[PDB]
Symmetry: C2
Subunit: 503 residues, 2 copies
């Protein structure tokens, strides 16, 4: 099995896990076009007999009694001689689908509606930090659901994923700082998770039981189960979970204005069950997290812009206090250095180029200054990778991964190189998984050990992107209160001319 997954569609496997039982109705007859293989236990007749019979006869009276209310709402309690069963309606490909789920034996009088929502929303009374908000949400989710581990992901612009918050019981390895490639999650999976809020993987050991028409004749395709919540997982992802060691999963999809921002993944080692009320409350909890994250991301970006301005401001205090600027940058290296979130600065101002922080060598920076002139840059230049644009520094990686340049003078070549380290260097290596387990897995698919490589070779020779705040600060320092720099140059020159006349 090679090159599998992305080619394979995931909405048309035609398989159902043994958790529930589904049937397909169509037309006034509501014929049993598609039936399950496990319906023998509940219906009491062989599935092939069920085929080609009217829905009124086949359905037990318990389900038929509240069928109108079931269509009105889509969820109500029906008690069978075996026991009570959750019932739902979902329309796919023009055919209605009746879904039956084994409800718990609990009387359900306890854990009433809307009180779990209060229990979940109470701890979030504070929650300043976006990362700390995700941490608190993970804590509450773990407290309610009882799963071993809760992890929260953020998706990068190119759909690279990382882990932000992690709430877990003591004992298992921490997964904070994880980075996994965008290709780990296929496009169709992202679309499906966008469409439906919750995904439940009841048990990994369970062998899927397929519905038993081979192919739908009228459609020519297996029945689509995208809306249905009983979709069977892909075998590749099943082996993923088997290698990782998690068997029951409960995944929540965080959406910011229709964009899949990240996922909450509740993981447990053994198959567990969750009540219907808890899941219904968790859907609302997902909506709350979506809204709160949508607001707080804007809050954090505004705060970062304000801090960038309030950091660029004091730089005018040093230059203007009397001390020469070339000594001033050495005096105040940190503030000028962190105006863009970069690690190296190099300045051309008329004299020999000056270096602050980790910067490329003298020959390298002068060659870069020579090379930058022919390209017409109206105000500034933004680049993500330097190897493609500039061959000579492609070999250099540790001080040549990122570049940001602004020309201080419109005519004269005044170059302000800003180098930001490679994404793999700026991110703490404490974020890697490490902790090598003794058993040897396939090492190609599973995340433990045999992963995090695709990230490092996909983003190799690439630095973290220059945010809107980063380029705004780049322009601001292209000025750097351009009055102070231009007027100190002019003032020094015009005092020097008077001194030379006095000379």
């Amino acid at each position: 099995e090679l090159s599998q997954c992305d080619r394979e569609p995931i909405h048309l496997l035609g398989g159902i896990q043994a958790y529930g039982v589904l049937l397909a109705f169509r037309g006034p007859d509501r014929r049993l076009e598609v039936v399950s293989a496990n319906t023998q236990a509940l219906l009491g007749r062989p599935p092939e007999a069920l085929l080609g019979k009217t829905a009124a006869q086949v359905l037990p009276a318990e389900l038929w009694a509240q069928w109108e209310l079931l269509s009105a709402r889509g969820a109500l309690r029906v008690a069978l001689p075996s026991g009570p069963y959750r019932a739902l309606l979902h329309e796919s490909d023009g055919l209605t689908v009746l879904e039956l789920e084994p409800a718990e034996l609990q009387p359900d009088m306890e854990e009433t509606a809307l009180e779990l929502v209060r229990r979940l929303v109470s701890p979030l009374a504070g929650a300043k930090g976006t990362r700390e908000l995700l941490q608190t949400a993970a804590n509450t989710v773990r407290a309610l659901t009882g799963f071993d581990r809760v992890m929260v992901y953020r998706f990068d612009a190119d759909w690279h994923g990382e882990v932000l918050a992690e709430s877990k019981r003591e004992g298992m390895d921490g997964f904070l700082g994880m980075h996994f490639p965008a290709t780990d999650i296929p496009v169709q999976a992202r679309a499906l998770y966008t469409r439906n809020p919750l995904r439940l993987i009841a048990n990994a050991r369970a062998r899927p039981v397929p519905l038993v028409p081979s192919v739908v004749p009228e459609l020519g395709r297996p029945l689509d189960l995208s809306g249905s919540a009983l979709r069977s997982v892909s075998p590749i992802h099943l082996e993923y979970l088997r290698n990782m060691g998690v068997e029951a999963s409960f995944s929540l999809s965080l959406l910011k204005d229709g964009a899949l921002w990240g996922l909450i993944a509740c993981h447990h080692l053994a198959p567990l069950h969750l009540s219907y009320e808890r899941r219904r409350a968790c859907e609302v909890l997902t909506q709350l997290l979506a809204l709160q994250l949508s607001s707080e991301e804007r809050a954090a970006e505004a705060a970062e812009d304000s801090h960038r301005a309030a950091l660029l401001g004091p730089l005018a205090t040093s230059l203007g206090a009397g001390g020469t600027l070339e000594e001033a940058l050495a005096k105040d290296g940190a503030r000028v250095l962190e105006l863009t979130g970069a690690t190296g600065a190099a300045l051309l101002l008329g004299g020999e180029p000056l270096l602050v922080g980790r910067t490329p060598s003298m020959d390298e920076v002068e060659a870069l200054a020579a090379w930058l002139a022919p390209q017409p840059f109206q105000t500034s230049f933004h680049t993500e990778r330097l190897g493609s644009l500039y061959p000579p520094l492609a070999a250099r990686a540790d001080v040549a991964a990122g570049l940001l340049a602004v020309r201080l003078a419109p005519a004269s070549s005044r170059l302000a190189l800003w180098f930001r380290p490679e994404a793999v260097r700026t991110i703490s290596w404490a974020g890697n998984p490490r902790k090598p387990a003794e058993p040897e897995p396939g090492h190609a698919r599973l995340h433990p050990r045999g992963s995090f490589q695709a990230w490092e070779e996909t983003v190799r020779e690439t630095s973290p992107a220059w945010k809107r705040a980063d380029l705004a600060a780049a322009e601001g320092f292209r000025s750097a209160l351009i009055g102070v720099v231009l007027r100190q140059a002019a003032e020094l020159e015009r005092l020097s001319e008077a001194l030379s006349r006095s000379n």
Copy 2:
């Protein structure tokens, strides 16, 4: 209309409204303490004879069968021969209470909770800022209730009332931007509003039926009903609610980190009944609005401050471009006004006074510059009421009600000042509904006048308080960010004179 209102104890009034009935119990013997006058219809036997009787025969057998069940939830729906009835239990004064309320005929099986919650949440998908958050929330709450006029109230630091947004159908009076003094909400009422989220006005027309006995013997005062949601309101508020003509109200409280930031008070001209599914939905909606309101408030700042810091930047571009400071302010007189959110600005860099915007004449400016030097302020002087701090300028405070002054020179007396207009002038006088009412009110207890008239005299010689961002910008103006850029003009002039007369 007697003996004012502040001394009146709301907590201890112990009144029972028209619809529901109450009865108290003590200990395992559950001695009956108090009864309502209207319970005889529901109980079927005279209330006076049951004083101190056992619950076995006073109360119908069905409630006693569900007493242990009612204790768990604290509220339950039960079928009674008269009809469905809804009962509650809670603790007050060491004495347990049983409350009975008329019940809606719906068995709470159709359109249950946790599916209208998403109906309320979905419109909030946008709401880029606080104002539209409140607008959308008010609109959707109005849609849920079906009431006539929803309203939102905001309180200042000194508890003065604001009206941010409202949603109304066509054909009534609007009070957007209308103002009410802090004393309109008694200090007794604020703590109670903090304690419980929801309070419902059952019927304004119906007089409060008395509670029997008139007073409990053991305590000497009627038992309080803070936990109860049926507690009757003051007779003083009956005249108010009659004057505005509303019949029922449904008060929703918005608390941020334990403080009454806002208050939602729906109004309906005629009586209307709301089910507890809706009530338990809107209490969740208040808990909802709390967090998102905090988030949007916290996001609004650090963006206004960022814009002010960025706004100060082009003032530097006014320099370097050919011209002096006088000419720089001549072309750019607009931008310097919003640097501190003040309509007038004055500067004194050593020469004759120069003014921008509507500021006091130069003689009083010189007088205040002379007077501020004896007053010890190291970096800035932020006074909200000028007359209290400085008598002579109290006479003309239309534009000099509030001032922010900074010393340009470190030791010498060089000043930069900003003058804000007095309040009421800045606010949009839209609080008047126009259309003087054909009925004649007392002009002291109604929406227009009485309220917003005591408020105006309460905030005479007052301006919006100097926040953090405007003073930060003001101190940045004097700080070595643009002040040094101003100083460099002196060195440029010095080099010009060095070139002058010597060539």
